[PDB]
Subunit: 116 residues, 4 copies
């Protein structure tokens, strides 16, 4: 909710993308990705409550949005296995990161909106 | 070829073929005058709309008839058309590619401008 | 607020696009665009209160987002005069239209999120 | 040329030149193996990464090193890189164009897939 929030929209139906699985990982010292947090988007296509200010320290993070299962459930053949968003969290910046993703079967866009 | 239009379909991951495109130029009386038109090819591209001589400085609108496109595929889309409005050649002649990426409830448009 | 809301984001700064002028028009019987509603986006990049359920009847509407002035204020040279979103409002659909726009100097995307 | 990568800069309205691109293929042990790499040309395109013979069915990741790109232009961007993960050739060989459109806090990626 507070420091990291994910929002997913469906460009085909013009709707929130509901029940999309989302996994967050943090990069470890041996360069592997450690599970950090996960959830499914709500009816408003949002996922809040992933982490806390205390836990969300500087580091490299990856957000993986399971887009292929979403399109499969709709009966629409998709290109990507999942959308991945990789970034370094930085304390000098604003306190709240919203990772937004706009999905189509053969294309996606992602935007970070970083606010105080 | 100072003006080229390229249209892609984000649902099918393909060129958007046979899409109507109308170009207008703003007249002295602030009205939109017809300038040129055509339909995208099998590669989703429309070349030959104008010439360097004809393509003078001015404000231009490129209307891409996306609703007709989606309707012919059985889809009822949100937008009537994608409109792209810009001032051209104000620093001297340039080569413009107007790209549009289409989904039923979303589109994006990008200009790629090169100095000949 | 209720039936029509506009949201604008800045892809360069990863922020809401604040103080962007937005004009809405409705198409008249003589095929001209009549001013309908307008405003400036807030600090959260949103514009609410444009119209009411009573006033927002079926018809063709155009939302014009004054992107060029926004980029000029930032000292960044932009391509488009403005982003235009043209659509037919339809009572058979959901009750609430959010027109979202993601802005970069040479590209923009727009998405309609239509909800109940 | 079964795999081509095209990268555009949405701030400058130009090809994104000299951008590093790394392709990986998922191995039998579920790890990512290096497959091919290169840098975009003056046209923002990268051709010649692979051959029809080499490009067998599998899961592929295309990593586009967008952070290095923006840094060299004086911009500190949000993402580390744009990642594009997909299953290839599962219905037989195809020709794939992976396009990426870049802004400092946003990117979009689109696949255009043609049957030879
Ligand atoms: O943090 C903030 O101020 C808001 C975070 O973003 N909200 C977004 C939002 C809300 C409603 C409908 C569409 C969108 C959207 C589309 C593309 C990109 C971002 C956003
Ligand atoms: O937004 C996105 O994901 C991509 C938007 O552009 N795609 C483009 C694209 C895709 C395949 C082949 C050629 C082109 C191209 C040429 C000139 C200008 C733009 C684009």
């Amino acid at each position: 909710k507070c420091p990291l929030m994910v929002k997913v929209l469906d460009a085909v139906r013009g709707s929130p993308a509901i029940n999309v699985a989302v996994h967050v990982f943090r990069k470890a010292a041996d360069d592997t990705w450690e599970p950090f947090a996960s959830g499914k988007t709500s009816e408003s296509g949002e996922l809040h409550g992933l982490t806390t200010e205390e836990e969300f320290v500087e580091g490299i993070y990856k957000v993986e949005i399971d887009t292929k299962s979403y399109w499969k459930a709709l009966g629409i053949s998709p290109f990507h296995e999942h959308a991945e968003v990789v970034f370094t969290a930085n304390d000098s910046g604003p306190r709240r990161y919203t990772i937004a993703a706009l999905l189509s079967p053969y294309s996606y866009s992602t935007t970070a909106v970083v606010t105080n």
